[model samples]
Target: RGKILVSLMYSTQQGGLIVGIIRCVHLAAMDANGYSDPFVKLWLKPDMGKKAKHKTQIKKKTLNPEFNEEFFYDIKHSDLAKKSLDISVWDYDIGKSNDYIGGCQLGISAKGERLKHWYECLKNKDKKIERWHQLQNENH
Candidate 1:
């Protein structure tokens, strides 16, 4: 339903992964005005603690949003294969449940470019690997 560009970097010394939220394009509209206040929510799968989840600010009334944000997760290279990243986009609705726009998962469990992006980040060490991933249904 949408597309998102993200960048990833892993630091061996710091023992963490850096997630970059570059931007989203052509998102699904949830509001009647044919637009959506979109935001990004991300999770480091198999929750290690409260720090597992991170979110971006809402971009008001636009189908395309740019969010140059970075988030960090403490993870070791040894545990990389056992972990995955879950990223979801949503329409912000006031005083009600937010509407799910779309999402994508990346890691060993993922396929194609998702897994390729994750693996590239892991293998490249401190270098950032950028890729565009298509958003998928929530059940994915």
Candidate 2:
């Protein structure tokens, strides 16, 4: 049997980003010869040194097979990097560690140029932005 897969990447408004892929296998079921039980699943983890504290499941039938799934995460600019990132994937059930399908270690920081650019933009927008926020929000 052959297989089909699709991959994609996107950025979020909250300074977070995501990369994903969907894989489809073209094969008949082992138990049910006549039926095709093709399925899809999703997984998420930190970039490298980071670890995944949770997992998410996406149903094959319920979700659009053509569209790669995406999730919004509360990650800081410091979180983006080649190292110190963790990621992983698994089958739909996500039962055991053996079921762990695939993953990657972010060997770079997630927030290199982006962080610098954001800071530059902030400076350009308001020279006193930092001071203003510090005075308004800081306890001291």
Candidate 3:
């Protein structure tokens, strides 16, 4: 087995913001016997840049020899959502051709879950007032 590297990135089309993270999940060795354990890497790119704004490394144990992981990124109120975002993975040692592994395209909503929760709370409050008013009128 050889060393495996994983890279993740999130980008918004509207804002042209991109976040990328990379990690050496498995340290490479000169030979097949020189393989390391699976690990994780996280990255963020607020704007499309040559380098990532933030990066993190995490190590985990897995039975599979192949590196399989998921990366999550958020796109908040971004114009870039109008177009497709590009994602790619590459190995520093192997170069672009053989080093290139795989990538995916994700469409994300700019709105956060918090916004929905807040709206729901407001709606409930309004409903409570409406019910209270209706009850008072009935009593009168």
**Please, what is the TM-score per model?**
0.92, 0.36, 0.28
lDDT of each structure? Answer: 0.82, 0.32, 0.29
Give lDDT for model 1.
0.82
List RMSD in Å for every model shown.
1.7, 14.7, 18.7
Which regions of candidate 2 fall more than 4 Å away from where they truly are? 1-12, 24-67, 83-87, 92-98, 109-140
The sequence of per-residue lDDT tens digits that candidate 3 reaches over residues 68-137 is 3433344343332432333333322232222223232322332443223222323332221110000001
Over 62-103, each residue of candidate 1 has an lDDT whose tens digit, in order, gives: 879898888888888777756798888887877776778887
Candidate of highest TM-score: 1
User: How does model 1 score by TM-score?
Assistant: 0.92
Per-residue lDDT of 31-93 in model 2, one digit per residue for the tens? 323323233332234423234333444323221223234443344445433223233333243
